[PDB]
């Protein structure tokens, strides 16, 4: 045996949620046709994200709460654009079955199977917040050090988080995950919102409080820190057991965090489970067709890696990129629009090599590799299909020898899917497993995924 790979079930770690991407930014209207795209290549690119069985069957996707008072430039219109003039005035909202695409794109994710959408805001409406303005950070009013002479907006902006989930469901597309604060460490120009860790906690409390009285029932998440260490900083003050006995963490149901100031490579020290809610290649460089060349930041290698390891090394339950479709020419999203013309890169192809086999509800299990040329993940679906991903980053062919060790289930077939420089995601032929045990050759600079049968 050349490289030895054992998988153990009866050593079993996190569960899985599930892989996916935003369409924010009014980037879902991309995918309906925006700047050209045919009704043919709409529904091949919602095919790719969202069907398994055609595609990368994405099961989370992440729509923006949009806080603007227009639709111009790429701005997320709001529910509640205008000020109620007091934060005890009757509210008027206003739902436009729209969401910048999102709404639509819901729908097609939703007919196609996708189970988990994760609302999130960047920030509350301007007439809420320290500066008046959704954007340059700012503080939501009455939150603790941040007072506003127009008074305190705490309940009003949770009553508003309410009011999108609810317009939400009563059109037929219920809201799983919701989230108050985008990257809080960030002082930019687009819209954005501070908030220390026990600022954030504060909030918590309260959004869960109000989800309580109102009888819906919707997973919390916090904070979508800009790092994996920035979002680990936040922990603490989401753990302090307040004068009710209460922490944020006990009404929290996720931790979320992206990978621009530092990458999901460690575990948080939080009990919840942990999402990596945001990450992409935002150099500008344009990498469609290269699953390894030199290590670009835009690669097909470096997400299977990013994943693999946001897995095993960092704990996570779930991945979801930046923009999954967009019409550009950077690695900014997983599959590139040209007009009419669909160029899904290695990036997406490696996301679906997961995502297509690696089900809600999964759970990770132990493998090991006993080669550093060669890295190794697995997980078992409820249905009892293991799923194991191994990148072999040699310059040559590896010949594998994969132990799935003690099962319920003799295992009679594995099927390889691969993914390179020359491979998307190619279905290889069935292998048979003989005491648990099977033999496969994977190519130089590659990722597999081997997917057991019944
Ligand atoms: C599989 O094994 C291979 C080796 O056989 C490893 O490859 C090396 O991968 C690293 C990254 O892990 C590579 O280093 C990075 O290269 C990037 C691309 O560089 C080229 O293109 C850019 C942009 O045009 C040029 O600027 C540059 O001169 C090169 O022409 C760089 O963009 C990266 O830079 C970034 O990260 C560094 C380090 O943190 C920062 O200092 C930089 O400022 C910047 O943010 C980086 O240098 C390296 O080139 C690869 N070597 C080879 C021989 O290919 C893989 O890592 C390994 N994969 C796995 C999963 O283990
Ligand atoms: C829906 O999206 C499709 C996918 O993008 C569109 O089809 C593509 O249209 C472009 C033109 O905009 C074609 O581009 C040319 O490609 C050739 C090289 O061709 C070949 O290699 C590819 C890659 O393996 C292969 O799939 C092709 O069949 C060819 O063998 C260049 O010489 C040209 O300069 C230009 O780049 C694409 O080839 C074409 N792809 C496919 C798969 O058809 C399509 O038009 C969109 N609309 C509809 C209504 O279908
Ligand atoms: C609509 O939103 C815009 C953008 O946030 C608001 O404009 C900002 O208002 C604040 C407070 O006066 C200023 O600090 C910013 O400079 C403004 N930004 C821009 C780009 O103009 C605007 O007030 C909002 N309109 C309403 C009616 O709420
Ligand atoms: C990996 O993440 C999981 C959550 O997905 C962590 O599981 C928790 O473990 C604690 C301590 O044993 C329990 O109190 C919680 O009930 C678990 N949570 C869930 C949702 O199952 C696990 O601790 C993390 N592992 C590491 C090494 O940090
Ligand atoms: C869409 O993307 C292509 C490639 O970047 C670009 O050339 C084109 O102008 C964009 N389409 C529009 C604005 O119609």
């Known amino acids: 045996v050349e ?5 153990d079930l009866q050593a079993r770690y996190q569960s899985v949620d599930g892989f996916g991407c935003s369409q924010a930014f009014q980037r879902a209207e991309d995918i309906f046709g925006k700047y050209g795209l045919s009704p043919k290549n709409q529904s091949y690119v919602l095919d790719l994200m969202y069907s398994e069985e055609r595609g990368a069957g994405f099961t989370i996707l992440r729509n923006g709460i949009g806080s603007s008072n227009s639709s111009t430039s790429n701005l997320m219109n709001s529910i509640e654009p205008f000020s109620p003039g007091s934060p005890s005035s009757t509210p008027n909202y206003t739902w436009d079955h729209y969401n910048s695409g999102q709404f639509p794109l819901s729908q097609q994710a939703r007919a196609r199977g996708l189970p988990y959408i994760y609302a999130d805001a960047w920030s509350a409406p301007g007439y809420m ?62 819209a954005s919102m501070g908030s220390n860790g026990t600022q954030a906690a504060e909030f918590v409390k309260i959004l869960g409080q109000t989800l309580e009285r109102e009888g819906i029932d919707i997973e919390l998440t916090c904070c979508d820190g800009v790092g994996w260490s920035e979002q680990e900083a936040m922990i603490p003050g989401l753990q302090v057991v307040g004068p009710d006995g209460k922490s944020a963490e006990d009404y ?15 575990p948080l020290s939080t009990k919840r489970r942990t999402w990596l809610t945001e990450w992409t290649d935002l150099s500008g460089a344009f990498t469609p067709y290269t699953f390894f060349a030199d290590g670009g930041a835009g690669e097909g290698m470096t997400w299977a890696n990013h ?39 290695k990036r997406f192809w490696s996301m679906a090599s997961f995502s297509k086999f690696v089900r809600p509800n999964a759970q990770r299990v132990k493998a090991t590799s006993s080669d550093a040329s060669v890295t190794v993940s697995a997980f078992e679906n409820t249905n009892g299909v293991v799923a194991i991903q191994v990148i072999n980053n040699g310059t040559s062919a590896a010949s594998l020898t994969i132990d799935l060790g003690k099962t319920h289930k003799e295992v009679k077939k594995v099927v390889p899917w691969v993914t390179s420089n020359d491979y998307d995601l190619e279905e290889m032929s069935e292998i048979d497993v003989k005491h648990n045990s099977f033999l496969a050759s994977v190519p130089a600079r590659s990722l597999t995924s081997f997917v057991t049968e019944c």
């Open 252 to 266: 929290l149901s996720v931790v979320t965090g992206h990978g621009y100031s530092s990458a999901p490579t460690f």
């Open 307 to 345: 994943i693999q390891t946001a897995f095993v090394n960092a704990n996570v339950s779930a991945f979801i990129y930046w923009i999954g479709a967009e019409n550009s020419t950077t690695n900014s999203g997983m599959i590139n629009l040209i007009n009419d013309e669909v160029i899904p890169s």
């Open 3 to 7: 490289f030895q790979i054992n998988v």
């Open 129 to 190: 917040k320290t500066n008046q303005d959704e954007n340059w950070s700012g503080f939501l009013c009455g939150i603790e050090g941040e007072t506003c002479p127009s008074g305190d907006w705490r309940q009003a902006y949770a009553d508003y988080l309410v009011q999108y989930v609810k317009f939400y469901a009563e059109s037929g597309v219920p809201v799983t995950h919701l989230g108050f604060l985008n990257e809080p460490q960030e002082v930019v120009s687009y």
